[PDB]
Amino acid sequence: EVQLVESGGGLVQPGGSLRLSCAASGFTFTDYTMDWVRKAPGKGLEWVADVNPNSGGSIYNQEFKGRFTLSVDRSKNTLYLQMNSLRAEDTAVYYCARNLGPSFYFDYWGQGTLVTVSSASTKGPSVFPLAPSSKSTSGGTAALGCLVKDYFPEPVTVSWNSGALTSGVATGPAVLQSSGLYSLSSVVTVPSSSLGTQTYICNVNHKPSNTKVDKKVEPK
Amino acid sequence: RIQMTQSPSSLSASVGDRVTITCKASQDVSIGVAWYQDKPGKAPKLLIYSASYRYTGVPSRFSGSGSGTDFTLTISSLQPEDFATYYCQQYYIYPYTFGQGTKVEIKGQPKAAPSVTLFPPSSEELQANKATLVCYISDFYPGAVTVAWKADSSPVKAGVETTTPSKQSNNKYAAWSYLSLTPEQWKSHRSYSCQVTHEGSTVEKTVAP
Ligand SMILES: [Mg+2]
Numbered sequence: 525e526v527q528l529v530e531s532g533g534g535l536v537q538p539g540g541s542l543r544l545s546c547a548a549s550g551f552t553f554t555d556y557t558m559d560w561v562r563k564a565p566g567k568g569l570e571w572v573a574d575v576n577p578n579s580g581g582s583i584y585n586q587e588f589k590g591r592f593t594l595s596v597d598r599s600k601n602t603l604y605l606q607m608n609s610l611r612a613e614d615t616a617v618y619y620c621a622r623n624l625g626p627s628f629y630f631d632y633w634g635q636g637t638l639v640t641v642s643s644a645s646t647k648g649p650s651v652f653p654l655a656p657s658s659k660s661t662s663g664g665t666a667a668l669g670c671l672v673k674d675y676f677p678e679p680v681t682v683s684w685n686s687g688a689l690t691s692g693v694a695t696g697p698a699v700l701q702s703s704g705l706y707s708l709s710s711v712v713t714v715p716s717s718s719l720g721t722q723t724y725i726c727n728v729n730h731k732p733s734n735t736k737v738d739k740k741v742e743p744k
Numbered sequence: 745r746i747q748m749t750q751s752p753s754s755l756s757a758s759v760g761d762r763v764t765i766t767c768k769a770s771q772d773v774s775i776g777v778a779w780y781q782d783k784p785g786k787a788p789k790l791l792i793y794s795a796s797y798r799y800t801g802v803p804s805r806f807s808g809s810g811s812g813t814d815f816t817l818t819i820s821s822l823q824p825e826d827f828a829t830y831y832c833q834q835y836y837i838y839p840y841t842f843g844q845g846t847k848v849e850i851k852g853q854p855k856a857a858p859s860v861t862l863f864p865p866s867s868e869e870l871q872a873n874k875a876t877l878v879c880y881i882s883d884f885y886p887g888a889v890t891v892a893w894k895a896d897s898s899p900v901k902a903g904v905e906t907t908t909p910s911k912q913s914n915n916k917y918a919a920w921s922y923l924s925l926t927p928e929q930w931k932s933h934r935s936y937s938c939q940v941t942h943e944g945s946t947v948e949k950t951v952a953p
Contacts, residue, residue: 569780569788569831569842585839620785628840629778629833631799633787654863654878659951667861670868671878694882694912696920699905707905709920711861711880744867 526550526632528620533637534732535611535646535677544605546620546634553577553601557623560594560605564616571628572618575603594696610641640677640732644704648735649675651728654709655744661716668741669711670726674703675733682710707738719743746770750832750843757822759803760850765817765846767810767832775811776836782829784910791830792817824850824914837889853915855943858884862949864940865930875930877923877951879938884909886943887917894937895929 532544548559560572575582575594582594593606603620617638619629654669656658661667672680682695700711710726720743728737747770755762767777775795780788781809792808795815805820819826827850832843859882862920863877881889889908893900903924909917930936931953939948 563782563788568844569833571840571842579760583838623835627776627793627835629790629835630780630788630795631790631791631793636787638944650872652866652869652876655866660861660863662859662861664931667880668865669863669878669880671876673864673869673874673876694880694918696880696918697907697910699907699920699922701905707922709878709880711882 525688526622528622528632528634530618530620530634530637533618533639535642536607536643538611538643540610540641540642541560541606541608542610542639544607544618544620544637544639546603546605548601548603548620548622551622553598556656556708557625557628558596558603559621559623559628559630561619561621561633562616563619563636564613567616570616573605574623574628577603607639610639612641614640615639629676638677638679642677644676646729646733647674647676647705649673649680649728649737651726651737651739653726653739653741654711656714656719657744664716665713666716666719666743667711667713668724668743669709670728670739671707671709672728672739674705675680675707675730676705677732678706679731680706680708681729682708684710684712685723685725686727691725745835745920746834746839746841748832748834748841748843750846752846752848753844754849756849756851759822759824759850761822763822763848765816765830765832765923767815767843769813769815769834771837772812773834773836776834777808777810777815778833778835779808779817780831780833782831783827788831793835819848822848822850824853826850827911843891853885856883856885856916857945858882858889858940858942858947860938860940860947860949862951864951864953865925865934867925870927870930873927875925875927877925877936877938879921879940879949881919881921881940882912883916883918884942885916887911888942889919890941891919891921892939892941893921895933896935896937900936937939
């Protein structure tokens with residue numbers, strides 16, 4: 525169907541600049557108006573900007589005028605949001621979206637990309653295994669997991685066995701520590717006999733630091 | 745300039761209940777109102793446009809009404825999968841203001857006491873001169889718990905961080921609590937425990953070096 529794929533999120537310093545892009549497919553790119561809409565924590569949804577992919581003419585919400593620039597590349601069906609003079613208040617998930625004509629409601633949305641505006645450094649996580657054992661086994665079900673410690677900014681994603689393992693997986697929200705760093709964990713429950721026959725690997729992605737960690741979790 | 749004032753902030757309702765969410769526009773917007781459903785980790789989904797037109801695939805339990813300034817989103821028979829934040833939006837007048845959102849939670853689902861799994865510090869972490877105990881709390885309903893930690897028999901409050909419970913399925917919650925210790929503190933006690941209180945009753949798990 526229609527697809528909208530964002531790239532570019534991560535950490536930016538106050539006053540800094542960041543470029544997001546949205547790759548569109550599954551429709552006539554020039555038949556529609558393209559938008560960015562953002563969702564900041566605690567705050568609700570805010571429309572940011574729209575662009576006519578034909579003329580390249582753009583309209584911006586008040587707080588983004590002179591600061592943000594929308595552009596298009598017709599040849600690769602891609603929209604670019606160039607953000608300058610960013611402030612802590614611009615921390616948000618940024619979505620690309622689509623509307624038709626003068627009706628600015630959005631039937632298709634991208635997946636979102638989190639932009640964090642902060643003076644702190646990026647820091648990739650330290651990943652530690654949470655080993656299954658008789659002590660984490662109940663009624664023949666063993667719990668194992670990974671602890672993703674001390675990273676910044678959000679987000680991290682976790683999969684198991686490259687996405688082949690999905691049932692019984694619980695990946696928690698992050699906690700913000702006194703250190704100003706985040707931590708989260710993922711725990712999966714599996715049959716005890718599988719501890720001898722199946723290898724378990726947690727795949728951690730921290731896109732803001734360009735870090736991936738594949739941690740083997742061994743029974744102890 | 746233009747405002748969309750959505751009400752209530754949140755609501756909790758039982759499966760099968762009729763729920764209503766309202767939105768007041770600060771000026772006449774005819775029927776140029778849309779409603780969206782937003783779930784954690786997912787992009788907003790369009791439910792309704794032109795105030796009362798249901799989008800492709802949206803269940804008929806969702807309906808919208810109103811024109812001018814007063815708009816209503818009605819869910820006729822609340823389902824577990826309807827747990828989400830709903831937003832109104834007016835879409836003709838710049839800057840196409842969204843309401844502040846209404847969080848819908850489900851009450852009255854079957855109660856379940858928590859399971860508690862307590863992981864000790866990994867050998868890798870201890871070798872990095874750090875120690876964290878991880879208390880994984882699962883399969884509980886409703887989604888409120890309190891966590892207390894103990895070093896041997898006595899309370900420890902320093903070094904604790906706990907998540908707000910997150911819904912894992914149409915029916916159950918999970919939560920995490922972490923205790924940060926030095927490797928010396930870990931090794932010097934007989935045990936540590938994580939005690940979870942849920943609706944006045946407790947489940948406690950204990951680990952030892
Ligand atoms: Mg969401």
